[PDB]
Design an enzyme around this catalytic site. Sequence first.
Site, short mmCIF file in Angstrom:
data_model
loop_
_atom_site.label_atom_id
_atom_site.label_comp_id
_atom_site.label_asym_id
_atom_site.label_seq_id
_atom_site.Cartn_x
_atom_site.Cartn_y
_atom_site.Cartn_z
CG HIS A 164 -1.83 1.14 1.34
ND1 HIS A 164 -2.90 1.29 0.48
CD2 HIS A 164 -1.87 2.20 2.17
CE1 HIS A 164 -3.55 2.41 0.78
NE2 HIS A 164 -2.95 2.97 1.81
CG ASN A 205 -3.85 5.85 4.12
OD1 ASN A 205 -3.63 5.44 2.97
ND2 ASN A 205 -4.29 5.05 5.09
#
Length: 265
Positions: free
Chosen positions: A200, A225
């Site tokens: 990720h 994020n």
Amino acid sequence: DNMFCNKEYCNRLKDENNCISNLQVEDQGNCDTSWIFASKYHLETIRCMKGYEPTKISALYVANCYKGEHKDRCDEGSSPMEFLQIIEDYGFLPAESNYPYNYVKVGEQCPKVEDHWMNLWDNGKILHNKNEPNSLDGKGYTAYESERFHDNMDAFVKIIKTEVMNKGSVIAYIKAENVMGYEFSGKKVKNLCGDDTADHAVNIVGYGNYVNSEGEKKSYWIVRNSWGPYWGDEGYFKVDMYGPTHCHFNFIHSVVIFNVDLPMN
Ligand SMILES: [Ca+2]
Ligand SMILES: [Ca+2]
Ligand SMILES: [Cl-]
Ligand SMILES: [Cl-]
Ligand SMILES: [Cl-]
Ligand SMILES: [Cl-]
């Protein structure tokens, strides 16, 4: 400028009147497209550092526009290298405003570039210069792994701090499971190990020093994020740089920087 981002402390989110603080957190929804969000944000901060407006790149265009055989663009990710490849292949980089992201459109036919669309890659060049006395530079990106700096973490930290100062961010890889704990919803500095691998992409956007709950002087990364502004701490989180002593692996698996030539605005 320097008061908000220097060798010891860097948080440009605190300077409400600067370019990077105006790049709002985005929400990738339920496709594995973090590679696009983190890569495009790295280019957005580079553009901010060169005096351009905080104009969002179209993540959806990058998802949907690729040469060659069909790819699974929602269920599987890719890599920052592929982000660069799409830029060089298409040469045009549309704005989110022109082709806005909804995860359910990830995988649809690449759209025609309309006459009125903005190109956020105009006058832009990915560097493939061969400068060093070896054949390995010139990829357009440079990657560093925390496992390779296991016995030299001070150098890993310094490289990252330098790039965050100069480029506004780096791309970082983590294992998504590691930020899934109930506890990641706080404003606390998280402290944990990474895993052998990552899956990720996020961005390191700042750092600072702090004292942990055990009374020890430590430092943290500020990490962005792409799970929307209601995840974590307004979409960001803080994590201890060096992490717990017993960890085989650092929470930050690796970082990637883009090597680009862009004229000042
Ligand atoms: Ca883990
Ligand atoms: Ca590994
Ligand atoms: Cl800036
Ligand atoms: Cl898919
Ligand atoms: Cl990925
Ligand atoms: Cl290459």
